Coordinates of N, CA and C in Angstrom, one line a residue:
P1 N 109.0 109.4 74.5 CA 108.9 110.9 74.7 C 110.0 111.3 75.7
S2 N 109.8 110.9 77.0 CA 110.9 111.0 78.0 C 110.9 109.8 78.9
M3 N 111.1 108.6 78.3 CA 110.9 107.3 79.0 C 112.2 106.5 78.9
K4 N 112.0 105.2 79.2 CA 113.1 104.2 79.1 C 112.5 103.0 78.3
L5 N 113.1 102.6 77.2 CA 112.8 101.3 76.6 C 114.0 100.4 76.7
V6 N 114.0 99.4 77.5 CA 115.1 98.5 77.7 C 114.8 97.1 77.2
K7 N 115.9 96.5 76.7 CA 115.8 95.1 76.3 C 117.0 94.3 76.9
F8 N 116.7 93.3 77.7 CA 117.7 92.5 78.3 C 117.3 91.0 78.2
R9 N 118.2 90.2 78.5 CA 117.9 88.7 78.5 C 117.6 88.3 79.9
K10 N 116.5 87.6 80.1 CA 116.2 87.0 81.3 C 117.0 85.8 81.5
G11 N 117.7 85.7 82.6 CA 118.5 84.5 83.0 C 117.6 83.5 83.8
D12 N 117.8 83.4 85.1 CA 117.0 82.6 86.0 C 115.7 83.3 86.4
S13 N 115.9 84.6 86.7 CA 114.8 85.5 87.0 C 115.1 86.9 86.5
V14 N 114.0 87.8 86.5 CA 114.2 89.1 86.0 C 115.0 90.0 87.0
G15 N 115.1 89.5 88.3 CA 115.8 90.2 89.3 C 115.2 91.6 89.7
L16 N 113.9 91.7 89.5 CA 113.2 92.9 89.9 C 112.3 92.6 91.1
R17 N 112.3 93.6 92.1 CA 111.4 93.5 93.2 C 110.4 94.6 92.9
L18 N 109.1 94.3 93.1 CA 108.0 95.2 92.7 C 107.2 95.9 93.8
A19 N 106.8 97.2 93.6 CA 105.9 97.9 94.5 C 104.7 98.5 93.8
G20 N 103.6 98.7 94.5 CA 102.4 99.3 94.0 C 101.3 98.3 93.5
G21 N 100.6 98.7 92.4 CA 99.6 97.9 91.8 C 98.3 98.6 91.6
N22 N 97.5 98.1 90.7 CA 96.1 98.6 90.4 C 96.0 100.0 90.0
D23 N 95.7 100.8 91.0 CA 95.4 102.3 90.9 C 96.7 103.0 90.6
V24 N 97.6 102.9 91.6 CA 98.9 103.6 91.6 C 99.9 103.2 90.5
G25 N 99.8 102.0 90.0 CA 100.8 101.5 89.0 C 101.9 100.6 89.6
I26 N 102.6 99.9 88.7 CA 103.7 99.0 89.1 C 105.0 99.7 89.0
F27 N 105.7 99.7 90.2 CA 107.0 100.3 90.3 C 108.1 99.3 90.6
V28 N 109.3 99.7 90.2 CA 110.5 98.9 90.6 C 110.9 99.3 92.0
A29 N 110.8 98.3 92.9 CA 111.2 98.5 94.3 C 112.6 98.1 94.6
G30 N 113.2 97.2 93.7 CA 114.6 96.8 93.8 C 115.1 96.1 92.6
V31 N 116.3 96.4 92.2 CA 116.9 95.7 91.0 C 118.2 95.1 91.5
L32 N 118.2 93.7 91.3 CA 119.4 92.9 91.8 C 120.7 93.4 91.3
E33 N 121.7 93.4 92.2 CA 123.1 93.8 91.9 C 123.6 93.1 90.6
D34 N 124.1 94.0 89.7 CA 124.8 93.5 88.5 C 124.0 92.6 87.6
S35 N 122.6 92.6 87.7 CA 121.8 91.7 86.9 C 121.6 92.3 85.5
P36 N 121.1 91.5 84.5 CA 120.9 92.2 83.2 C 120.0 93.4 83.3
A37 N 119.0 93.4 84.2 CA 118.1 94.5 84.4 C 118.8 95.7 84.9
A38 N 119.7 95.6 85.8 CA 120.5 96.7 86.3 C 121.4 97.2 85.2
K39 N 122.1 96.4 84.5 CA 123.1 96.8 83.5 C 122.4 97.6 82.4
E40 N 121.1 97.3 82.2 CA 120.4 97.9 81.1 C 119.8 99.3 81.7
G41 N 119.9 99.5 83.0 CA 119.6 100.8 83.5 C 118.3 100.9 84.2
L42 N 117.6 99.8 84.5 CA 116.4 99.8 85.3 C 116.8 100.1 86.8
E43 N 116.0 100.9 87.5 CA 116.4 101.3 88.8 C 115.2 101.5 89.7
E44 N 115.3 101.2 91.0 CA 114.3 101.5 92.0 C 113.6 102.8 91.7
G45 N 112.3 102.8 91.5 CA 111.5 104.1 91.3 C 111.1 104.3 89.9
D46 N 111.5 103.4 89.0 CA 111.0 103.5 87.6 C 109.6 102.9 87.7
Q47 N 108.6 103.5 87.0 CA 107.3 102.9 86.8 C 107.4 102.0 85.6
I48 N 106.9 100.7 85.7 CA 106.9 99.8 84.6 C 105.5 100.0 83.8
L49 N 105.6 100.4 82.6 CA 104.4 100.7 81.8 C 104.0 99.5 80.9
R50 N 104.9 98.7 80.5 CA 104.7 97.6 79.6 C 105.9 96.6 79.6
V51 N 105.5 95.3 79.7 CA 106.5 94.3 79.6 C 106.2 93.4 78.4
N52 N 107.1 93.3 77.5 CA 106.9 92.8 76.1 C 105.7 93.6 75.5
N53 N 104.6 92.8 75.2 CA 103.4 93.5 74.7 C 102.2 93.5 75.6
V54 N 102.5 93.5 76.9 CA 101.5 93.6 78.0 C 101.6 94.8 78.8
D55 N 100.5 95.6 78.7 CA 100.3 96.9 79.4 C 100.4 96.5 80.9
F56 N 101.2 97.3 81.7 CA 101.4 97.1 83.1 C 100.8 98.3 84.0
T57 N 99.9 99.0 83.4 CA 99.5 100.3 84.0 C 98.3 100.1 85.0
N58 N 97.6 98.9 85.0 CA 96.5 98.6 85.9 C 96.5 97.1 86.2
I59 N 97.5 96.6 86.8 CA 97.7 95.2 87.1 C 97.9 95.0 88.6
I60 N 97.3 93.9 89.1 CA 97.5 93.6 90.5 C 98.9 93.1 90.8
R61 N 99.6 93.6 91.8 CA 101.0 93.3 92.1 C 101.3 91.8 92.0
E62 N 100.4 91.0 92.6 CA 100.6 89.5 92.5 C 100.5 88.9 91.1
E63 N 99.7 89.5 90.2 CA 99.7 89.0 88.9 C 101.0 89.5 88.2
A64 N 101.4 90.7 88.4 CA 102.7 91.3 87.9 C 103.9 90.4 88.3
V65 N 103.9 90.0 89.5 CA 105.0 89.2 90.0 C 105.1 87.9 89.3
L66 N 103.9 87.2 89.2 CA 103.9 85.9 88.5 C 104.2 86.0 87.0
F67 N 103.7 87.0 86.4 CA 103.9 87.2 84.9 C 105.4 87.3 84.7
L68 N 106.1 88.1 85.5 CA 107.6 88.2 85.5 C 108.3 86.9 85.8
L69 N 107.8 86.1 86.7 CA 108.3 84.7 86.9 C 108.0 83.8 85.7
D70 N 106.8 84.0 85.1 CA 106.4 83.2 84.0 C 107.1 83.5 82.7
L71 N 107.8 84.6 82.6 CA 108.6 84.9 81.4 C 109.7 83.8 81.2
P72 N 109.8 83.3 80.0 CA 110.7 82.1 79.7 C 112.1 82.4 80.0
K73 N 112.8 81.5 80.6 CA 114.2 81.6 81.0 C 115.1 81.6 79.7
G74 N 116.1 82.5 79.7 CA 117.0 82.6 78.5 C 116.4 83.5 77.4
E75 N 115.2 84.0 77.5 CA 114.6 84.9 76.5 C 114.8 86.4 76.7
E76 N 114.7 87.1 75.6 CA 114.8 88.6 75.7 C 113.5 89.2 76.2
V77 N 113.6 90.1 77.2 CA 112.5 90.8 77.7 C 112.7 92.3 77.3
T78 N 111.5 92.9 76.9 CA 111.5 94.3 76.6 C 110.6 95.0 77.6
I79 N 111.2 96.0 78.3 CA 110.4 96.7 79.3 C 110.4 98.2 78.9
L80 N 109.1 98.7 78.9 CA 108.9 100.2 78.8 C 108.7 100.7 80.2
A81 N 109.5 101.8 80.5 CA 109.5 102.3 81.8 C 109.6 103.8 81.8
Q82 N 109.2 104.4 83.0 CA 109.4 105.8 83.2 C 109.8 106.2 84.6
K83 N 110.9 106.9 84.8 CA 111.4 107.3 86.1 C 110.4 108.1 86.8
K84 N 109.8 107.6 87.9 CA 108.9 108.4 88.7 C 109.3 108.2 90.2
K85 N 110.5 108.8 90.5 CA 111.0 108.8 91.8 C 110.1 109.4 92.9
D86 N 109.6 110.6 92.6 CA 108.8 111.3 93.5 C 107.5 110.6 93.9
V87 N 106.8 110.2 92.8 CA 105.5 109.4 93.0 C 105.8 108.1 93.8
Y88 N 107.0 107.5 93.4 CA 107.4 106.2 94.0 C 107.6 106.4 95.5
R89 N 108.3 107.4 95.9 CA 108.7 107.6 97.3 C 107.4 107.8 98.1
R90 N 106.4 108.5 97.5 CA 105.1 108.6 98.1 C 104.3 107.3 98.1
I91 N 104.5 106.5 97.0 CA 103.7 105.3 96.8 C 104.0 104.2 97.8
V92 N 105.3 104.0 98.1 CA 105.7 102.9 98.9 C 105.0 102.8 100.3
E93 N 104.1 103.7 100.6 CA 103.4 103.7 101.9 C 101.9 103.4 101.6

């Protein structure tokens, strides 16, 4: 509708730093310089809605982190996201 659907190959890690969790949702807090996730256009302040076929709209940050780590190395990741800069800037507190 007015979102982002990105597909990139995970190398060693997804290179995403995460903020939020549970109620507020999972947000990109940092995207590693020149990583596949960056090149595909993911950016600090996007909300992550779905990773592959897993809904990310009510997940505890620590499970989100591990799930991203647990994605298999060298495989294609599909991320559904939406830019929520304003909510994000409020959220990080």
